[PDB]
């Protein structure tokens, strides 16, 4: 487990600039991030176990997202992940 | 930073170290993971904050998070499967 509160709060300021969050709601959001990330990371690790030298790249995360997220959430998440990787490889 | 290069708020470097802690692990796997966690966080917080606003309060509480998730079949199914263990 890792603390993601600062990041959850930065995103809250983007979406609802003048809205706060209670301590218990932030605890639930930290559990949300950690638990979803554990499922993503676990599925990516399972897929990488099939790779000759166990390589993990964005493909294993994309395939995990498609398996784990339902319908439109998966479509949007894939679009967000692909856009972030495109930005990352194009920039320094 | 890797997060700035990716246009993200979520911590790409820390996520990359977590993936390595569990073979070559590309930084793109950490960028893609941070992007999907940031996307899901933004969707949940926006819907919960809209429930807070409709209730004429100034903060998100666990009940607003529950109202958000219950009002979206995809978020409800994702949380149900996460709690179940997939």
């Amino acid at each position: 487990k890792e603390s993601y509160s600062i990041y959850v709060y930065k995103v809250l300021k983007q979406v609802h600039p003048d809205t706060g969050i209670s301590s218990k709601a932030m605890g639930i959001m930290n559990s949300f991030v950690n638990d979803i990330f554990e499922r993503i990371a676990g599925e990516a690790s399972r897929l990488a176990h099939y790779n000759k030298r166990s390589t993990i790249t964005s493909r294993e995360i994309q395939t995990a997202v498609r398996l784990l997220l339902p319908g439109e959430l998966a479509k949007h998440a894939v679009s967000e992940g692909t856009k972030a990787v495109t930005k990352y490889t194009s920039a320094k | 930073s890797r997060s700035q290069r990716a246009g993200l708020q979520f911590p790409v470097g820390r996520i990359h170290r977590h993936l390595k802690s569990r073979g070559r692990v590309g930084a793109t796997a950490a960028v893609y993971s941070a992007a999907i966690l940031e996307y899901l966080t933004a969707e949940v917080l926006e819907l919960a904050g809209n429930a807070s606003k409709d209730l004429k309060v100034k903060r998100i509480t666990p009940r607003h998070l529950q109202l958000a998730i219950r009002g979206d079949e995809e978020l409800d199914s994702l949380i149900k499967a996460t709690i179940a263990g997939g």
Binding site: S5, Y9, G20, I21, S22, S23, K24, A25, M26, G27, I28, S31, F32, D35 | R59, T61, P62, R63, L65, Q66, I69, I79, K80, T82, I83
Partner: peptide, 23 residues
């Protein structure tokens, strides 16, 4: 610390003493 399973309680009754998260 609050588990994600908190969301699957029949009906969450918000705690009066649920302090504000502080940046």
């Amino acid at each position: 610390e609050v588990g994600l399973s908190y969301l699957m309680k029949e009906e969450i009754q918000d705690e009066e003493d649920d302090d504000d998260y502080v940046e």
